[model samples]
Target chain A: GSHAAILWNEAKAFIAECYAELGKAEEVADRLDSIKSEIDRTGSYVHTKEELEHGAKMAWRNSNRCIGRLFWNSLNVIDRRDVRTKEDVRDALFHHIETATNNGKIRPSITIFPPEEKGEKQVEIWNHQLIRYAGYEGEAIGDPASRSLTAACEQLGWRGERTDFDLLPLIFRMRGDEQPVWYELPRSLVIEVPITHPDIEAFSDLELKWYGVPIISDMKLEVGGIHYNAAPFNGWYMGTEIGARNLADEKRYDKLKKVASVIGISTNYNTDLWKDQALVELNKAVLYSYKKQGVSIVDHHTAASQFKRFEEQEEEAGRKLTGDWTWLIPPISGAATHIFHRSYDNSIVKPNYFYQDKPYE
Target chain B: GSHAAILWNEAKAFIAECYAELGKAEEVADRLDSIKSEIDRTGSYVHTKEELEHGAKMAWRNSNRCIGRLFWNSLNVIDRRDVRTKEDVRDALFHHIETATNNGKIRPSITIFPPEEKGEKQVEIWNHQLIRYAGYEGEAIGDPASRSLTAACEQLGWRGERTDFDLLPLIFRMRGDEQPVWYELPRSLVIEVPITHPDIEAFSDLELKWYGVPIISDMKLEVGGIHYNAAPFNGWYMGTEIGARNLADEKRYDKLKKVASVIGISTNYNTDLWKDQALVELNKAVLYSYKKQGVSIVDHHTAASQFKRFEEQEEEAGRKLTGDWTWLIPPISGAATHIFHRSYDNSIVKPNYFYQDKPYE
Candidate 1:
């Protein structure tokens, strides 16, 4: 089959790279020939625990849109390929949240669910993130980005109080299951930080907050052509991702108007620069809140500088680094960061995390 | 004569566009065939006065990196194609600055000087702009961007007091001239606005100022097959161009530290968002100063809104608008603009301004 041929080529490339990196360079062809024969006989081959572990870290390193890749060497890859039943999948996910959250220290981690050949006997996770706020639809209130997912939960018979920060249920399924399973996450296991400004005491009265860790579960982890559709991974937040974008964008939480009003600035027009002022305050609030709450987060400037250092490290390794320019530059005061002055090639490399269509959709 | 062939094809394409826009739709082939005969006879064609006028306007309209294309329709095409000497070139440049500046009610204008066959005979302007400040090396007190040009001027026997706002001399040369000619711009004809903040009284202490018009003189203006290397053009300032970029960028004026100190903001780190705050204030100051001086300028928000309208108009006209995404988004508070959410095609179209090799080494 063409799929098997593609899998063979992909597997061969990764195995050579994986073993060589692990200082078993002389034994690469030994593994390659064995994998080639296995794939020829059975149409696909299983990845050993060692191959899976290094490949997950390699995937993070190869993610072109990621800015926090300086610590790609230290990613915690939890092998959960043994979990098959829906309950077992749910338990492993809960443990991922607990381990990554780390009571606000926010470790970078990924949990790899079962991997199999494509187009047959597959598993899937329905949540965009393991933990995220449920958005309500209307002219106003809650995150508009989450409206579709929120509606999906409602259709599945899970009810929420419809608060702005209400956590959505985890939904997942295995092959041959008649219906996808959904369950509310335990409240204590989820972590959140209340947003408050360092100088503006009244800013806290607006009652804004965000989840402590981002566990993106929607992407398929493609490791040497074996598909792990249920792999979710995350790093600590960069304050601008929450403050300047999620909370301050006109399309999202849209706090600029309220913030400008709270701070009592002239909001007559854009020339008054009320939006720009509000943006800084919102970002400041996010950074202050996360830091005071003992949650791990980095400011945009620090992250940009870290990315610059990572570029040098990549250069030292004689490896070409690829990146998406739009994703790398911060939303607010983009030119203020060094990343804005440079350009990046956005070529794709594997094994990497790649987005797949939502199974429910 | 492949150059003649290229020129013939370019001429045919542009004549069709030019005459059609002027409602001379049936007369295009007559003009195109004449251009073909002229190109075959002399290895290049001369454009009709109407073609040059309409084609320059089309060039501005087709400029992929320009954010202010809404005003392309009203561009003043000052035809100076008869000028052949350095004195005529220098005088024409002065006229461009004075006419475009318009006593603070600046106008969108371009002066097309002496278009002829390329590689045989050519006119040139060495200044990036007809009016700009000089830069000194060794840690910089003036515009660091102008250091090379400033050194070029000094080597040609030009001198200045080296003030922060010292205007550089205009330099030009006709083909086969031994050296570039330089002359100080008549100071009265060169208008400048003193930079001041609307709210921050201390901002005036810096004594920063900028020339009233941009008058980009270095780029070659190609309309049909003719090349006008000395063509200069201007549009009123976009506040972010001066404030967030020219002033705040570390490579340029780099004023964030001084501005933050003057405003007494916390300078501890990026978490303080001192750079972002400084960017907003600098942009605010630029807008405020230009408005107070009665000079034409637009804030980034208004310009973005106008570009959106321009997009709609282009769509209505059954024409596609091409733009560079990097140049479309504002340097500061980028996400606040509607342009940020949109992407643009960066395909190059003809009858456009293009960078050429500098006449001076």
Candidate 2:
């Protein structure tokens, strides 16, 4: 039975790989140079803070095409019709971004490019959970984490409970010999958004949030489950703990290595000697790749309609999903129904394909 | 009677002329050059707010020397000590400077040097009042009109009274060729100090005093006049105002002309034709004088203690005895009874006929 299951999994994986490549090929309105270079430039200025922020904004606007790329690649593997586009996808994302800024009760983390690599083994690939309600006490100003939502709501100073928006987690990936790729991440794991990307410009009441908050932005982030004040300026200062997720951990490295290999961007995993050398070569290639023109490197469209659609679907289905999100909890009746059904019927499916089988039953 | 008095006044005018020369000769040591350069270099990096802030600090530290130099030059002139040697003057000034930084209520400004002349009036001077703290409820920091200072204080977290301590008013002066001559100013206007010396090391805090108050020395000064907002970075900006003081003010020009005439420094004063010619002649003369060192520029030891002593004794006779003072007000207290009079009054007797009163008096 175990051998049959393994064989079935391998066949499914092959089909998925083929479909993903097909989708990637279809999304290819532009050339490979265009795509790779477009993504690589996002990480050029990531070394310095000023450069990094500007680079991030540039990446944010450009993230639309990146989203296109993501959908193209993933959908191709599944042999599905790609519905995403530079315009519609951006508009949808931006709609949610605007709503989150205006009506959300939390200060959302400004998303950047996707991480080129992931998992515990790749030291360069890291994650952070930023906190909300830092200076929150009396009442909700939307979600403490969603400044964009609050800002959108206060366009005319409209006041009320405006906390039904959220920004998805993004991966700021620095891959081997490539510029970073900013993409939406699996939001289930990341609890809070880091404060590094301040919403001061996007919001008026920054001090009410920043000062009111204990300034968690000043604290070093726990990258790869280890606290590291990543000092890019000082090249990582002393007393910094080695992240628990060592880059060489085979299990996680395999996942990231697979991503790189599938994309044909070198991973340099098998030969540790090739790590730095690969990084250097990849860096140069990426630098050269990014020199091309005619590629749109910026994308600033909002994705509000997409979230609205998702909300509508969730409401229409009357099905329950269990999750805690800032300014994004469903109505009490809906939440209760969701909890009861998932517990009773065992219909809840997590992103990892795990089934919480009959929790209440 | 008026004619005779005029003749006597003419003789008295000589004293004023000498005072003016003395003031011009008393070099105003300051550290402004480096700051101006920094503003130029970093001001271009305003694309990022963080970069702008860093530039501001560089501009500020370079310009902050106004305070230290102000006190230093004031003491030098008020006490009338032509210490002549930069090393000796620096040593004495540094003593007080050290004290000012350690104990003074304000942070002292660091001194810097200027660049070699390039093109004409190309932002070589930042209108000096940015740290003035105008309309300050307390001590003045720098001036708000000054873009560099505003940016600097903002970066330093001195954005307002709510954020920073009091700041002293900053007075900055600029010249195309002439050096600073602070000694000639009336004793009544002896408050401003220079923290940086152009050609020499700045005085340490313990080197000087203000209003009979002892100043502790350090990198910054304690101030007591205005409010300044600390900021992340402040540097010269394109929108920065072109200061009237930085231009060719008539009074200043005339003063320069008169002093140049007396001290034998070249000037383009009087006849439009002679202005250029005179300047050239003066330049040549200066060069020749340098070549013939002993014959042209004579160095002499002039003690401040001696001059101050003379002024005290002259004040006691209830008449103008010291023709050396350009502007003299009648002394209110009898020299014998004045607290600071003991040294001079006890030593002087009847007035000998070195200077006789005019017939009008």
Candidate 3:
């Protein structure tokens, strides 16, 4: 029962923020009274459209791990809160993909489904991301990060010829069902930019491509006291996420050797530093290609600088910016960034994004 | 009194194990009864020569951050529990250097100074390590890791010629003393290994060297609820400590560029991986030089395997190994090691080593 008091306090703070941001502070007390009563009766309360949208933005703004939170307020929140059927879930996600892609200029967006209810069946999306690579016979063809989801897709009768850029389908289910089902996202809805280096002409021949938006589909959204189990979200790619980790990590594409070979660098000795050199060019290619294609993407330097602006803005707003310094700092040339020179408080607060159980189980 | 009871129970477990290892566990209760009464009245108990020696080893064994704990039982405990003066502290430290060096065999040792007592001036050592290189004018003449301590050394009127291998003087003070004083370590007592790569002919010309042993002087030893602030201890090198962090971190020597230059690698772009290549060779040189000099130094892989054995041994002794996973895992090739694969319980237990307040004001 004491936990109810905590939820009420959290709800009141968010309600106040919503009213203040909307310039309707006069309505705060009135809205808060109903919230208090609902929380007292059900240990949770429903958020209005305005409140839900604002709360999602606040969650992004408060994300400790996200360096791109400078544009938190720019997030587009699609209200799919009433959708209950699997087909409705699939269509809403597809619509989200279409709207967010916007031909070439990818937009950051979140599509929130129904909140968890005591007697109601839970809605869940199984894939790690809205778009991911498929794995077959131990080799990951699409995105290596999506290996588990690819395996799950195989179990559900998904058959794709092993290719480096295959986009995984969206998989979701209602809680009472024994197993989940998936739908292949339409190829027309996804926009991919071919990777090419500005200075290196040979790099364009490698045919590397990546999707415009990385919509994370596995995280749960907790606002006030309610849990939105099917809230999938995305932002445009940060160059390093594609260049440094996605293509470089051994379990993933591991493009360093191939890129090095193409670059005509010697990797035979320990002193050649071929991998490090290849990684930098790959990252350069990602940044250059995204800019050339007119798709929304940020280089690590620009992202780090924007994050610095966010810190300053937070200070001016009389808030302490909580962040995971390790995550906020990019993997390459990290020391050159201002984020590397400082420490951050990593404490988590709600309304926030949270890791939920894997849908594969 | 109850805290003493807790301390007694903790000490008894270790004492019983020590006796068991020595095949004298049948006499443990007899020894523990006297220890209990002494602690009950004074809130502290004394360890016998054998008990003190074994207790220190057990503390190292329980240290979660140490990967070199497999030789915990082999540590030489130099008991100086009677010394109170600053001069005695200096002399004992000098003696520790001589004995632990062992003409390059590099014995693991600890010189335990007087324990904490109420209404008396406590003896303190200001340096982070017993043997550290002097820093001068923004440059590390000897070891770059000691640059921070160099400023404090300079503040105390310590002067240096700014040479590449200047040994910083030992600095210490009693609690009531107005300020600390310094003493130059006799050059004859310190053993150093000049680094050289196995196959690189030019590496020897660089003239890089490190001390035979790492005697950490600042950490406090807590055995049975008593805090000994001056328990400076040493272990033979774990090669990565010298190569990875000491030589590689940006704040330290930052030798990657220099090493890569010597290796004649392309540093024109990130794809060359000049830094990564140099780092591996630098690490290899550290191991090669130490082994060639007949100095004991464990490579990260060997240390990880030894730590695994330590874990197994503790489990056999019916003790759960508590460790700081981040510190236990080596810096280079961390994920390739077993310590990276498993999660550790990082709970701190007494009869342990702990960081205390800075000896400097």
Candidate 4:
């Protein structure tokens, strides 16, 4: 038997909403009937091309936590529901990175894998992102968020030299009960920008580099109540996510102190504001490097303005933009954004992105 | 007779803890006896000089959300427990600003008001901070946090020109039943820092300024189970608290655009990275102006490092540092700070700071 029947009522409601929005109510009845029959038979159903495309956009629109939801309809949805092997999944991810990177003109893309089946082990990607730094035990390097996955990869026979910027290997499980396998991302497919400040030459010596696009792999994409467990999505980098949080967070790269030392910022007293000075330059380098590399990345200010436009557009469309104000606002220059001045209604809607159980122990 | 008698058990536990920490265990029994007698007579009891001083530090230490707890014990306690009149409260507050500013070398200090008495009304300050911006209708100016207070001040007969940097008049109510009164901070008492960047000369043209110290007047101080609703406290500025959050927060000054425009950075696309570049200069100007004026303001890095040291010292002292990792980390360069990489025990202990009923409707 299937793990559990798909949420029929939810799927129905979502289909109704989608059809209504797309001015295709004529198809809702047939779609719902097919979905109901598929759920009864196999616990899930395949989304039609229109459903896939519209659902991807709807998922982005319903992502209340994302400030970048202004470009929801612009998402490039890749349908890979046929891939069942681990190698196929790996190849699809590689294609995603290459296609999304577009030689620096990053595309917001998502590759939808086959949905979970009832009573059957589901296919899942264990990594937080398609590309992240590997964290090791004693000499931890890279993004701290990738610590567990890095350890999991090492256990799966992937070796790490424990460098500060080691790219974590991608690990995926084919079946729920099967052992997880790991694959090294081809360096040729990965696009990285080496950080350098416009004024600070010493910044280049840090050898700080970050992946061009952030492709979140662990999150499940719920489309019309069907759980796509291996739907990995990519968005262009928000510079702060790289420079301010990822590279600058003490638990992560912790590059501020080193950057401060290199920039000759005085730590004579806490009030010297040297850290703030260093942080600005560190962030500057990230923005500068990305721009210099022709990599697509957004600054907080521009994101805020775009978000404001999104709010206005949604308002014009007569739809209330439900949002997590805390997440919608950028980490840096948050107050300078319009989102910071206002409160947002944080109601979850479908289709949407969601956290699911980790694929591997 | 009182609204409800103080929690005697909570007081007893606190007394026992304080005396134990101070190595005055022998006096614990006597102090507990006196506290019980006082509670029997009235709802609340007075704190001894030592209890008051230690309680203030403890409150600071137990402020789980604060990043400035490293110097908890270093807080200068000003005893104004006898002040009953609105005039006295205003005078003492003025004195607080003067003393804490210390000619640009800001001090961390708290002026304790009398504890809440039963049925009778208690003193309440209607200001978020002792010094804040006055907000107006279309031409909103100053810190957005102070908009409500600014409106309240205007209702109480304080006029503001609605400039981008009009300092809001201080407003407070002495009696719960009586109308709140307003008092403008003496221009000399409030040390304003005119922001100017080292490289960006046009930054000075904005005529942006901020006060040297932040005296949070709204939060209640719960020490030894007694609540001091009118206890106002001040700490030296953390540059980002002003630059990144206050001036840069989209809700506050939202200056990134203006700053970016002045710096001649492109905002044509999100990837232009204008916001991050502008934010750095804005922060740099704040730190530069404060340092040039000899004002004491800690940078996020130093604050984080100090917090780390604080954690170490606390561990050495056999005290577990409980904190809200989210609040304990600075808004900017958070990842670069030690507080970001680790989890914290968020258990709330006393004496502690707390939110209380709004002084006004």
Query: Candidate 4 DockQ category?
Result: acceptable
The lowest-lDDT stretch of 10 consecutive residues in candidate 2 chain A is A234-243
Q: What TM-score should be assigned to candidate 4?
A: 0.81
Give, for candidate 1 chain A, the lowest lDDT window spanning 10 residues: A115-124
Candidate 3 lDDT for residue A77: 96
TM-score of each: 0.97, 0.18, 0.78, 0.81
True contacts reproduced, candidate 4: 0.52
Best by DockQ: 1
Measured against the true two-chain complex, the DockQ scores of the candidates, in the order shown, are 0.75, 0.00, 0.09, 0.36
Writing each residue's lDDT as its tens digit, candidate 1 over A1-361 gives 6898888889878988888789999888788888988888888888888898889998988888899999998999898988768888889999999999999988999998887655654568889999998888656657888888888888889987878888998988788886688989999999899999888888988899999999999998888888887789989999988987788777888888898877778789777777888888888889889999899999988998999999999999888899999878888777877899999999999989898887664
User: By lDDT, who's the top model here?
Assistant: 1
Q: Sort by DockQ, best first: what order? A: 1, 4, 3, 2
Residue A359, model 2, lDDT: 8
True contacts kept of each: 0.70, 0.00, 0.00, 0.52
The sequence of per-residue lDDT tens digits that candidate 4 reaches over residues A1-361 is 3334347767777888888989998988877787778877866667788887899899899898898988998999998989878889889999998999999999999998888765354677888889887876556556677777777787779987787778888888887456888888889988888888887787778888888888999997888767787899988977788877887665667677788887877657544556656766777778778889899987777777888899899999989789986577666655556776688899998889999887555
- Better structure of 2 and 4 per TM-score: 4
2 against 3, candidate with superior TM-score: 3
Error of 4 at B53 (Å): 3.8
Model 1 residue runs over 4 Å out of place are none
Per-residue CA lDDT of candidate 3, range A1-361, in tens?
6667667777777787767878998998788888878876876788899889988998998899999999999999999988868888888988988988887788889998998876344787887888777765554466656677787888889877788877788888887898888788888888788998876789977888888888898898888767787798999888888887777767677687788777777666432334545666777788778878888888766788888999999999887789986567666545445776578898997778998778563
By TM-score, the candidates rank as: 1, 4, 3, 2
